[PDB]
Symmetry: D2
């Protein structure tokens, strides 16, 4: 399942794309500044790039400005059914909170919004459960007269005892049965339910070698203020270096079929 | 940056492979399969340690023939203090069952054996718990007049509910604090306390995370290697898998790991 | 921690109350019969009883619940799944109950909190026990903001994720959630769930939970035990409810006769 | 069901208590504390096995056994200790991590003494049947009776640095046809939790078990909430009175789950 997203193609058989945004809220002008830096970093490496909003009316307006000034596709989380219409009018991709993955009214209202949807897998789900979630979203899309190839399955961690998430790299393989692009959320997969930014690169490298369609990471736009006890965000001035590694990994594992298929 | 016979191993070296079979074969076939593995690894310049399929006196004789005929370093599991002399008198590297990782009498008998030891992390340990295991093992070696840089720390999964292990890639980075080479066991990490499909998945993830070494079992009879069989890569696919893994390992070791700078 | 719940008071210092409903939908007439049978089973043992709707997984379901109330006088609880359902179920039901996975969906929980009805708030299987305090405190602020009293919430244990497709019931949670200052309810039916087939553990966990010390207990019952197999819903056969409840009464009395030692 | 020292133990019997101290005492105060536990348990008719808090430890355990006429239990840690330990004690106990180390479990099996086999924190409850079935094969091949083993729940790993007590395990392990023992002190321990010992004890006894292990703190003056996972000695009577009431309640009639 390799689908169209904005003006590029995404999927397990395509070069990985990045979703990134900031771990702090900036002024309008600085939000554009940071988005522009990310655009340039990704452009030089040829990594397809979707900008994610740092946060409602005002947040959406600024996202609209990012889209218009920088020609970027943008993505935001939607939190309730009542928000969908307003958000989907502005953004190119909706993203659902993990804990709502089985709130069928909500997921289906997103599915019929007219925009593609990055569906986060609840931390209480087994990887096989995503197939049901995607199948029912597709049925909602069909019934609204919309194409079915408009969903991604997003791994964000599974509950591991109390106050911890583990990233089971097996999930990234299993969710290929959804026939939907698999997206790895590196920032939320390290979060204790900040202080874990050291594991963002670790998990990103592991996930990209596992084989995914896309990756989400938050970035810290003020490396001067970016500390190990802060958000689980990669400093902006190190993003280039990490992406170069991830491109090499992505190319390596997609040069030939994954053995586990073969 | 540990010396291990003919080569050096470590996070700062190319990864080494420990591999042996998921089935016991006749003596002649055992030598045959060890030979094939030696050549596969030779063509790719992957340092190779052979693991015994017998882990009794008969199995040690056959392992003796493997070493004499092929010159391979040999690794074996040992299960009790008595097996150490019986074995450490024939093999080059000892390996300890994960469930015995805090059985200090046994781990310290291995530490004083005169052979290097790959010490498996218990499925009930947290990654930070390995430092104390290695530190006490090094103490034992020192008290016996042996050098301290003779231990590896081996990740083999952590318990995840009932009848399931999960491979937390964070552990591979955390155990770097042991100043011991970290080894990833891909075959036992997938096991349900029928999962061969996850062996290449976890090997790629672990190699991209950054390890000193990797353990995988191989199936020597690919005509009879099935999905519901052992958690083993068919011998005829090992070369292709190792080529992927070499590419990933070289890629992540080209520069310092980003997480070091956090 | 005590709380008025219509005709009775509930709390760690009161006799436990039961929430029970069927695990299958029955005809209108068997629905009424079954509700009367449960009423009687509980009446004979003096177990305060709240009837749970079988129709909550519409207007018909609500009509029938209306007949249950009008005919039998039972207080009625229902799961609600969206903000819209709150107003829809208002004329019939007495107690709202929230899906576990919505425990942090603030718009939804605060709508429940403002409904005018008390609410049994299920703890998500992704939460740790200490997390429930903030959930309850948020619900109370919403209640306050709407001119409603704050002593109208209960905290319901329904298990926590344990690897894949498995829930474990950490009895420590039932003690820890006392810090919410709200009655703690144990859901013995969804706590055995394998995210049916686990009905053998419903009495096990109900006994354990009541001996741990709770305000309330939710169990489903099966009205047609002869159809009720080991592979079916996680429900106590209706003809065994009396015997189980007599055991649970005895446990509840034993553990509340004196202070809980963990409080010393 | 089976005979243990002087008495019958099992799901169809009044629960027995295994208890020992959370701190090593002097010989005389070890004796006094075992004495006080003995009296507490006798007043309530609770069958009581004392667990030791190597030569010297076994010497003192032998004095407890003899002077107070108590059965005694201790952990064995290697095959090499078995013969020395079994000549002194009435019940062997195996560390949970060793539950699959079959040469070691089977040596305990042939020892001639009964064995309380701890379920490792890495095992699923169904896994104990194979462990116990093999122990029994080892007993039989040695000419000993097969009804000399107990399955002991001590927690299962729950993420990192935490154990959870799945009360389902206590019912599932009934399939072993061996008495199930609940370890309330080790089931709370983080791989400062004494407040959960009474919680888990009440829960396990209501679930239905043959036996219960708890540590007690013999110096309640020094016994703190940040201290061991141990019930102060002066509160054991009150706790045991509650537990007996629960044990009688759930054993009065068959367990509903037995359908």
């Amino acid at each position: 399942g390799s689908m169209k997203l904005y003006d590029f193609e995404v999927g397990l058989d395509q070069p990985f794309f990045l979703i990134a945004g900031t771990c702090v809220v900036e002024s309008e002008q600085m939000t554009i500044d940071t988005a522009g830096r990310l655009k340039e970093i990704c452009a030089k490496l040829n990594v397809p790039f979707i900008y994610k909003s740092s946060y409602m009316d005002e947040g959406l307006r600024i996202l609209g400005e990012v889209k218009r000034q920088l020609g970027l596709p943008v993505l935001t989380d939607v939190h309730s059914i009542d928000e969908i219409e307003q958000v989907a009018s502005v953004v190119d991709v909706l993203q659902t909170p993990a804990f709502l993955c089985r709130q069928t009214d909500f997921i289906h209202a997103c599915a019929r919004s007219g925009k593609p949807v990055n569906i986060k897998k609840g931390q209480f789900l087994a990887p096989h459960d995503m197939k049901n979630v995607i199948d029912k979203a597709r049925e909602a899309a069909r019934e609204a007269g919309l194409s079915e190839d408009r969903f991604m399955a997003c791994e964000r961690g599974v509950s591991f005892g109390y106050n911890n998430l583990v990233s089971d790299m097996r999930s990234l393989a299993i969710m290929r049965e959804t026939s939907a692009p698999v997206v790895f959320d590196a920032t939320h997969s390290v979060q204790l339910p900040g202080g874990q930014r050291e594991f963002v690169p670790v998990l990103a490298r592991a996930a990209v070698a596992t084989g995914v369609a896309g990756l989400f990471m938050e970035t810290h736009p003020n490396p001067a203020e970016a500390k190990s006890d802060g958000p689980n965000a990669v400093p902006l001035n190190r993003m280039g270096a990490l992406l170069e590694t991830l491109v090499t990994l992505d190319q390596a594992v997609k040069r030939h079929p994954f053995l586990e298929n073969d």
